[PDB]
Write a protein that binds this ligand. Structure first.
Ligand SMILES: [Fe+2]
Length: 820
């Protein structure tokens, strides 16, 4: 009556960022739980404590850091078929359980458990850790002897909403963004609570429970570690893959070290020519020994720079200068990066002229554009013909920036304009910028037109920089932080609270959450906190995160679907005669054209997976875990917007498909497209400035004369200063790196995630289509008719939506999740 089992675990030291015999004896007990035989109270019968017997060295399938143990369970004919197990760790040190495999049992001959969980000493847990077999069950199909265990494990994951969360807790719950300020250190570091009001609505984040500050009971006190539920806090076999901790080290160690060197006046405070900037990746920058000594031993940080270990630090050469050092300065590239750059999804089509503002004129005055139709060079078209043939588009930030420019322009080292850019689609299918409008409140507007000669060519170059400062802010805080990182976290929380590990939709979605809560927590601690990396390098300083709350007011879940976005922005129209059901108005638009192929692939996968478990609309309605999950994700997780009419109701098969498709799209391809191009395009600070420090010089001043004689200096005085540049380059270099243990779209981290062979086959064909799509995109980049937008004058093929990637700074590869 003995069942042979194999346990696979990883000792803690393998996964730490920096013998086996101790696991034998009576150090680790497992008890099997019956799926088919119940006790008096209807719960599956539990077997006896069984201990690890010996090491299994002759297991061929083991990966790095993994060890296997033999175990034998006495299990007689009264016990039935195992469907779960308890495990108790009596050691003092936690370990990472991977799997349990039982042999020669059940009609399938083998029962597989995939656990991937941290198991601490049984004393630290209020209830015993339980793990289920790899079957998939909607709630009403749960074997009756497991139903109660399923419900109790979910209760355990929800907690009660009280207490300070400890490292070993696995408790998922919501709180507002009240942990970014630090008013107990200084009132200067006070920040508004984001979330829970109509003024400052925001997605919720993971609750940590550290308790209130003394100066403000609405704000959470600081802590050395921002808690995440334990199995969200990913360990890695290689310390260099722990990218998420780099922002912490950059903020706490590296940044102070850089600041010291500059205050020392050992390095010049400012760039004085463009060559000073290019030197950063050619010969490097000389810094004091003390400062280099702080970098070279730090894991993760030590990979960002070449160094001789004493005085020289050198950044990698950014892709956007790999061929032409100057091409970024062309109007062609400026426009091309709005459809193929780091932030390719804000441009809008223009259907009337001039553009209008929606801001209240009683407060802001007339905000109607001062651009005149007759002033534009539209390659011979008239305005009427350009409008009617859908060849006018705008990159418009006026209404986003104008209600904040007064507050920003009062900061010491910040000056900005609210901008509008007009773009004309030429006959060759490339976009041409034809006007920039620079606005100030109280409104004052200057229109700048393209010029290649004279003083007006410098005013135009600077005007482009003010536009890109707007765009960089919007990219970092809205396109990137708000729309991917922050919008996704509530869905992660709700999924673990309300869908069992056994649930088919849990298995569909959870790979697309990998590392998301982890990076978000570390970001709240060191990236978007008061005086953190964003606040000290990007234009809006202390207003940065609140701006993203102002924009979240206009966030609509169903408008995150790629076809809906394209139609909403007026760059595509509905067309059922086309493959994707939408016709692009910029035909070669590289982000959208490739993205539609990825979107369609995900859609087929979701459409082939969901019907395996839901045959009719009523099955969706009658899934209580699914209904509670969606109710809480809307009413709590995105609860400041719970009264909007556009939320799906989750009453049909079609709704469930669309809800899961949008979530997967956001976590994978959308985040990839806006994230992994940051250093390739923005590693040159002149191409993607993060801040502007002055307004345009007035005629008759020294600054204006400087413009005439020394345009490179005029440009550098206006954009990001040298010291914040070094910090921002470092953080976007981290963000643009693929860890070697990344899981890419089309892959999973274990081949036994379900026992359902039909789901496995559907997942196999998904991965097969992704390979077909990659070949198609490779062909697009080699098509000479598409070079103008897919490569441009920088000659940088658009690879950001290729599915697969090796490790490193590759400018390709779509991860499953928001993992950095
Ligand atoms: Fe990211």
């Amino acid at each position: 009556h003995k069942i042979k089992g194999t346990v696979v675990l990883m000792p803690k030291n393998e996964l730490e960022v920096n013998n086996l015999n101790a696991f034998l004896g009576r150090s680790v007990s497992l008890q099997l739980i019956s799926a088919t035989k119940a006790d008096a109270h209807g719960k599956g019968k539990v077997g006896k404590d069984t201990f690890l017997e010996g090491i299994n060295t002759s297991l061929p399938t083991l990966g790095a850091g993994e060890s296997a143990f033999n175990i034998h369970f006495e299990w007689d004919g009264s016990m039935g078929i195992p469907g779960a197990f308890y495990i108790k760790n009596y050691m003092q040190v936690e370990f990472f359980l991977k799997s349990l495999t039982l042999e020669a049992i059940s009609n399938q001959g083998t029962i597989r458990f995939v656990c991937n969980s941290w198991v601490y000493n049984t004393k630290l847990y209020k209830s015993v850790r339980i793990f289920f077999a790899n079957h998939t069950y909607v709630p009403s199909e749960t074997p009756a002897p497991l139903v109660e265990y399923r419900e109790e494990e979910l209760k355990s994951l929800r907690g009660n909403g009280t207490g300070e969360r400890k490292e070993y807790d696995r408790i998922y719950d919501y709180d507002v963004y009240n942990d970014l300020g630090n008013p107990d250190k200084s009132e200067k570091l006070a920040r508004p609570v984001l979330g829970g009001s109509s003024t400052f609505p925001y997605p919720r984040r993971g609750r940590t429970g550290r308790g209130p500050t003394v100066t403000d009971p609405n704000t959470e006190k600081q802590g050395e570690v921002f808690y995440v539920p334990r199995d969200e806090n990913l360990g890695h076999l290689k310390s260099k893959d722990a990218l998420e901790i780099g922002t912490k080290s950059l903020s706490q160690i590296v940044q102070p070290a850089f600041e010291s060197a500059f205050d020392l006046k050992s390095t010049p405070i400012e760039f004085h020519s463009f060559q000073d900037v290019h030197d950063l990746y050619e010969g490097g920058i000389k810094l004091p020994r003390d400062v280099i000594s702080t970098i070279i031993p730090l894991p993760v940080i030590k990979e960002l720079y070449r160094t001789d270990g004493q005085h020289i630090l050198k950044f990698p050469q950014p892709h956007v200068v790999q061929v032409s050092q100057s091409a970024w300065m062309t109007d062609e590239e400026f426009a091309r990066e709005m459809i193929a750059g780091v932030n390719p999804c804000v441009i809008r089509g223009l259907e009337e002229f001039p553009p209008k503002s929606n801001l209240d004129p009683a407060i802001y005055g007339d905000q109607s554009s001062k651009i005149t139709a007759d002033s534009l060079d539209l390659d011979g078209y008239t305005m009427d013909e350009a409008l009617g043939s859908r060849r006018l588009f705008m990159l418009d930030y006026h209404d986003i920036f104008m209600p904040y420019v007064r507050q920003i322009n009062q900061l010491n080292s910040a000056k900005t304009y609210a901008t509008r850019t007009i773009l004309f689609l030429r006959e060759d299918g490339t976009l041409k910028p034809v006007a920039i409008e620079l606005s100030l409140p109280h409104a004052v507007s200057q229109v700048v037109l393209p010029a290649k000669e004279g003083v007006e060519s410098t005013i135009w170059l600077l005007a482009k920089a003010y536009v890109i400062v707007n765009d960089s802010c919007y990219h970092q805080l809205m396109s990137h932080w708000l729309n991917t990182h922050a919008a996704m976290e509530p869905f992660v929380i709700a999924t673990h609270r309300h869908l069992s590990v056994l649930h088919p939709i849990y298995k569909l979605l959870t790979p697309h959450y990998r590392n998301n809560m982890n990076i978000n927590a570390l970001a709240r601690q060191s990236l978007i906190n008061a005086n953190g990396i964003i606040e000290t390098t990007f234009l809006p300083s202390k207003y940065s995160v609140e701006m993203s709350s102002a924009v979240y007011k206009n966030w609509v879940f169903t408008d995150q679907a790629l076809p809906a976005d394209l139609i909403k922005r007026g760059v595509a129209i509905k067309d059922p005669s086309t493959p994707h059901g939408v016709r692009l108005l910029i035909e070669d638009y590289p982000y959208a054209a490739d993205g539609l192929e990825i979107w369609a692939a995900i859609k087929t996968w979701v459409q082939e997976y969901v019907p395996l478990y839901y045959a009719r609309d009523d099955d969706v309605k009658n899934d209580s875990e699914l209904q509670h999950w969606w109710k809480e994700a809307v009413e709590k997780g995105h609860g400041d917007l719970k009264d909007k009419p556009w939320w799906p109701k989750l009453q049909t098969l079609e709704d469930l498909v669309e809800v899961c498709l949008i979530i997967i799209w956001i976590a994978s391809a959308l985040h990839a497209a806006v994230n992994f191009g940051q250093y390739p395009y923005g590693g040159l600070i002149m191409n993607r400035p993060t801040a502007s420090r002055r307004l345009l010089p007035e005629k008759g001043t020294p600054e204006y004369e400087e413009m005439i004689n020394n345009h490179e200096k005029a440009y550098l005085r206006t954009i990001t200063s040298k010291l914040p540049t070094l910090i921002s380059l470092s953080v976007i270099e981290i963000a643009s790196t693929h860890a070697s243990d990344e899981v890419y779209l089309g892959q999973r981290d274990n081949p036994h995630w379900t026992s359902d062979s039909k789901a496995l086959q559907a997942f196999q064909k998904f991965g097969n289509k992704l390979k077909e799509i990659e070949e198609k995109l490779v062909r697009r980049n080699n098509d000479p008719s598409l070079q103008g937008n897919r490569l441009g004058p920088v000659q940088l093929p658009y690879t950001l939506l290729y599915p697969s990637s090796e490790e490193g700074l590759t400018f390709r590869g779509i991860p499953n999740s928001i993992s950095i």
